[PDB]
Design a binder for these strands. Structure first.
Ligand SMILES: [Mg+2]
Ligand SMILES: [Mg+2]
Ligand SMILES: [Mg+2]
Ligand SMILES: [Mg+2]
Ligand SMILES: [Mg+2]
Ligand SMILES: [Mg+2]
Ligand SMILES: [Mg+2]
Ligand SMILES: [Mg+2]
Ligand SMILES: [Mg+2]
Ligand SMILES: [Mg+2]
Ligand SMILES: [Mg+2]
Ligand SMILES: [Zn+2]
Lengths: 211, 142, 38, 175
RNA sequence: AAACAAUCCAGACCGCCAGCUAAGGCCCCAAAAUCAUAGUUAAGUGGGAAACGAUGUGGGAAGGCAAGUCGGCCUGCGCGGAAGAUGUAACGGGG
RNA sequence: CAUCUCAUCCUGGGGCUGAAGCAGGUCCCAAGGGUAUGGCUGUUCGCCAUUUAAAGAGGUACGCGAGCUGGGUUUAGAACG
RNA sequence: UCUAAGCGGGAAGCCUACCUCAAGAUAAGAUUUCCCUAGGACUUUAUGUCCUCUAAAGAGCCGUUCGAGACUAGGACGUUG
């Protein structure tokens, strides 16, 4: 299903007439420009490759210059593919635009983004590990992992053991979000809930796959 | 007079295509392994690969006897703490017949660099057509 | 069903059947005479 | 086998062709098909099938008996089909054969729509009654059993879907 | 004999790109039979196990009743009985 | 901080019932997930209080002290019988 | 007679399905676009050697930095900002 590429602009609230306050995220959607269409005879799968935003000409390589010039679009700051079906490819064509009116108020969507990076983190923050007693004779180990295995059988650490490591900065999808408003003059989506990432980060909005 | 080894530079690999329709799996794999190893040549050398290329077509029509289509299990371990996975002969032959032929033949070959080089020469295809017509394979009827 | 190592006719209406290599006893008179060897 | 070694009677009107290992029985009310086991061959005189094993083994005699019984059913049903009767017992249990579906009310929170296959036809003379019929005896039995499976007769009062030719184990709940 | 002091075959003076054999083997890993003849098993039994259970299936000696049928034995090979902890894991593997 | 087994505690699917219904008893299949907080005691356990859908049984050097503790037990002091 | 031939139904379990990673998948896959088109000599006569001319697409160093970060890596920009 074809989606949009926008930018997390920030969070707000929307008051309903009945007094309910709704936490919302504003996604700014520069209208996406179709750069390529992949079909079964050429690529082995059907997809719509789209670009959005703008990139100055000195940061655009010659390869990408020619790739955007083949289509009738200007270079954007990123290029993304959406895997689609036929009959979801009727009025789509290279050099076309996919705007914010692809979504309706109340439609359920999934938002994909890059979560905030927390760097190197320990078991407590990364795996919800429990701390050991702060003061009952406890030595210099309060937030440490504890045991990492067993004795001589198996005599190793198993794969997938939860240890300290880099946390966040991953691709995350939040499903089941509702479209609170579709401002086509501001080119903005307003969705209910929280979406992954920081303000200014790239987010992909798709129709919900749960259906 | 001393016994000579085949030089790798003068080994002549030949291409063959065998049809697997309605053949016993193991009884075809033994002949494939013999051809791949080069055991049918008088220049046979255990440290040299002098075998032939073998194209297997219609690989998904290979047969097992008895009740093995349902009873023969194929195992994997992902090396994760509970990650032992299991499949059937009939599920795997309708999903990956090339893995069936590769597992059958790789166990009948030597286990080492030369063995991997020998297994590289078996090309397995589920359909009736293969892409190696440039190599002009001869019909090896087993 | 009774899953036993010893299965046999109980009443005169119990039939001894073999199904998929399992010896079973099915009875039309008494549903409680159903047996499977195992 | 005694079931085999007895020739099936073909009434006048039904044809039975034997193209290959397949066997096609055409009649006034159907076109059924059958496969012959590799251990048994077929031949008519003019209007009588005589199934006989080849190689004369015990397996072949078993398979020949099976082929004779199935072909006798095929001829019988293609000439004049089979029919089965279901009876619904219990208050509120109703059945309506509309179009090619059976709408059943069997003490549930929703009525069951059963979709008859292309071989089987259904009818309803009375609400607590279904008469199915088809050429295929196997298909008829399958449809009847699948309908009965929705609500089988219970021992304590007999309520449910039952066969007309079915004896029900009755019980009681003396304290 | 997978691996395996004490099992089986065999007692190493040194050399050889010679031959015959033992135990054990001869589809492939891996040297030699996809050898031959006649049977049995369908359980991957072979390739772990008992009391006991059973119209499995092959053979033998009888017996009763008369389109053959009944149920008693003695045996060959099978079936159930048969649940464990890192990973198939009770043919070394492929098969 | 775990990981496995299944001889299953809950949840899922069935047979029988001395199964009216509700609810049970018992056997079969099933290891995906889940599977208390406290008082007492060094306790494991156990008892009790109150929950829970349930508060499973085991293996892992009776898993885990070059990860923590050191209450018990098993150094040297001291006392009672 | 559910099974021998043939045809079905049937579970939180299995395979998919949902999410994330993933071509070092050495079998290293695919698509789009972009760049490089000079002369000689010497023989070991061949992805041969040396000399002259060439230095592309792009990448990096470096700098201003970051909602990215142990160092890295990654993202943005460097005056036409
Ligand atoms: Mg200290
Ligand atoms: Mg401290
Ligand atoms: Mg080890
Ligand atoms: Mg050895
Ligand atoms: Mg000899
Ligand atoms: Mg050999
Ligand atoms: Mg032979
Ligand atoms: Mg169990
Ligand atoms: Mg307690
Ligand atoms: Mg311990
Ligand atoms: Mg102490
Ligand atoms: Zn009985």
């Amino acid at each position: 299903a074809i989606g949009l590429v926008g930018r997390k602009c920030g969070m707000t609230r929307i008051f309903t007439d009945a007094g309910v306050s709704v936490p919302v995220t504003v996604i700014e959607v520069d209208p996406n420009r179709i750069t390529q269409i992949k079909t079964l005879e050429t690529d082995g799968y059907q997809a719509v490759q789209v670009t959005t935003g703008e990139r100055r000409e000195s940061r655009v390589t010659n390869a990408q210059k020619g790739h955007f010039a083949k289509a009738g679009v200007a270079a954007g700051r990123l290029v993304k593919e959406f895997r689609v079906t036929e009959a979801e490819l009727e009025g789509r064509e290279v050099g076309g635009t996919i705007g914010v009116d692809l979504f309706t108020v109340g439609q359920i969507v999934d938002v994909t983004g890059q979560s905030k990076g927390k760097g190197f983190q320990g078991g407590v923050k990364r795996w919800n590990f429990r701390t050991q007693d702060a003061t009952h004779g406890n030595s210099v180990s309060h937030r440490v992992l504890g045991s990492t295995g067993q004795n001589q059988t198996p005599g190793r650490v198993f794969k997938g053991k939860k240890m300290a490591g880099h946390l966040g900065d991953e691709r995350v999808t939040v499903q089941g979000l509702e479209i609170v408003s579709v401002d086509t003059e501001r080119s903005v989506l307003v969705v209910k809930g929280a979406i992954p990432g920081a303000t200014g980060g790239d987010v992909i909005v798709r129709p919900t796959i749960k259906a | 007079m001393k016994t000579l080894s085949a030089k790798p530079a003068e080994v002549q690999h030949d291409w063959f295509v065998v049809d697997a329709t309605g053949k016993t799996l193991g009884r075809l794999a033994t002949e494939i392994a013999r051809r791949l190893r080069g055991k049918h040549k008088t220049s046979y050398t255990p440290h040299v690969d002098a075998g032939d290329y073998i194209i297997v077509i219609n690989a998904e029509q290979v047969q097992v006897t008895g009740n093995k289509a349902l009873d023969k299990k194929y195992y994997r371990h992902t090396e994760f703490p509970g990650g032992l996975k299991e499949t059937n002969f009939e599920k795997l032959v309708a999903h990956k017949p090339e893995e069936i032929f590769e597992r059958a033949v790789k166990g009948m070959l030597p286990k080492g660099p030369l063995g991997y080089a020998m297994i590289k020469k078996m090309k397995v295809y589920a359909g009736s057509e293969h892409p190696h017509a440039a190599q002009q394979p001869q019909v090896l009827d087993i | 069903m009774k899953v036993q190592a010893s299965v046999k006719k109980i009443c005169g209406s119990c039939k001894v059947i073999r199904r998929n290599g399992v010896i079973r006893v099915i009875c039309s008179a008494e549903p409680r005479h159903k047996q499977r060897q195992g | 086998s005694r079931v085999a070694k007895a020739p099936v009677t073909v009434p006048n009107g039904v044809t039975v062709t034997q193209n290959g290992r397949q066997v096609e029985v055409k009649g006034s009310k159907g076109t059924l098909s059958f496969n012959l086991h590799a251990l048994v061959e077929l031949k008519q005189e003019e209007g009588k099938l005589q199934l006989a094993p080849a190689k004369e083994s015990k397996d072949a005699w078993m398979q020949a008996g099976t082929a004779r019984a199935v072909l006798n059913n095929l001829v019988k049903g293609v000439s004049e089909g089979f029919e089965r009767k279901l009876q619904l017992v219990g208050v509120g249990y109703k059945a309506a054969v509309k179009g090619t579906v059976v709408n059943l009310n069997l003490g549930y929170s929703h009525p069951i729509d059963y979709a008859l296959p292309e071989g089987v036809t259904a009818e309803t003379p009375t609400a607590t009654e279904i008469i199915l019929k088809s050429a295929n005896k196997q298909l008829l039995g399958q449809v009847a059993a699948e309908i009965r499976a929705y609500r089988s007769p219970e021992p304590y009062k007999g309520k449910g879907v039952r066969y007309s030719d079915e004896v029900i184990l009755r019980k009681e709940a003396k304290k």
